[PDB]
Design a binder for this molecule. Structure first.
Ligand SMILES: COCC(=O)NCc1ccc(C)cc1
Ligand SMILES: COCC(=O)NCc1ccc(C)cc1
Lengths: 191, 191
């Protein structure tokens, strides 16, 4: 038995498990299956400790998973909120800055403030605003005007809809990865 | 897309990941790769939350993994020690009670006391003795006779050697499971 070849096979399998768990995380996010999302997130987080070197494709995969983890915790050792952390990941993923990227970016920026107002924490809403960003938005926060028409166009539902359309593209791109394809064949054979 | 067929494929893949991670955990235990063992253990623990129903084979797999986890923590919400917890798993696994089973059982029973004496905790050694079990063993603990010839036949090294021989049988039995076999093929193709 060669120790190097065994370690290489473990790294190949970790890569397969990462894609499979990304696909499961994407579907759970799309479906709103919170408990399944939490379980898949924990498995993907543990599995990637088996990798010390990642390709460009694998880095994009883990950053998509970290991004969805923050978006899912949006209303729930960093001194920033989950939506602010999602915005940092979003702005640094190796991906095209098309119209959809910018739409998601601006929806998260406004919702990072609006989720604080929804929870009744207006001081945090101002702190979030100061870290991200103008005089019209600060007057809205100061007036506790949570249902201002600006927030109805840049809504939480609109942020989730746009992120879900992005998730469907990731989902289709990874639907043919090794582990899910082999698992679907086994299920189809029964049946 | 059928939600039931997607969930079935996820359960098939969780099963494949469980066998792969058992095989990796067995090799790391055999090799004494502590950090790799800790990482694999965490991944296997997270992955099995994706399973709510297990076959007899899968139950044996998870119990072997829980047993090795306690043996590896042997010298490190239950009011018992890790070796005592390993003994509980060992005595209830659906497996043959051959001579090797009994040898491992008795080595763990004595080492559960001896590891407390090694750490200088003789009160715990007596508490462990009371929970497991005689007058000769209690005199040894009372006298802090850690290097009594009884402990040299029923040694920690002998316990580890016997458990490692058992691990080699599990390792050979699972060496042909789906995920490792497909991963070894990929590595062999390069080389
Ligand atoms: C880095 O901060 C922790 C975190 O985001 N955990 C969720 C997580 C899910 C999935 C993957 C691949 C990686 C991480
Ligand atoms: C049940 O007590 C926790 C524990 O033993 N964790 C390690 C663990 C490793 C591997 C598997 C499959 C399952 C559990």
């Amino acid at each position: 038995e060669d120790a190097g070849l065994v370690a290489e096979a473990e790294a190949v399998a970790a890569g397969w498990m990462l894609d499979f768990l990304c696909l499961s995380l994407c579907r759970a996010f799309r479906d709103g299956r919170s408990e399944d999302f939490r379980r898949t997130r924990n498995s993907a987080e543990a599995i990637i400790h088996g990798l010390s070197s990642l390709t460009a494709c694998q880095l994009r995969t883990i950053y998509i998973c970290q991004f969805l983890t923050r978006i899912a915790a949006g209303k729930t050792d960093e001194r920033i909120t989950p939506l602010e952390s999602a915005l940092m990941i979003w702005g640094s993923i190796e991906k095209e800055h098309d119209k959809l990227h910018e739409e998601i970016q601006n929806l998260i920026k406004i919702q990072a403030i609006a989720v604080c107002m929804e929870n009744g924490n207006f001081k945090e809403a101002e702190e979030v605003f100061e870290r991200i960003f103008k005089s019209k938005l600060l007057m809205i926060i100061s007036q506790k005007d949570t249902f201002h028409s600006f927030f109805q166009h840049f809504s939480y539902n609109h942020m989730m809809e746009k992120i879900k359309s992005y998730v469907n593209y990731v989902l289709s791109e990874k639907s043919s990865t090794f582990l899910m394809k082999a698992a679907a064949k086994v299920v189809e054979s029964k049946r």
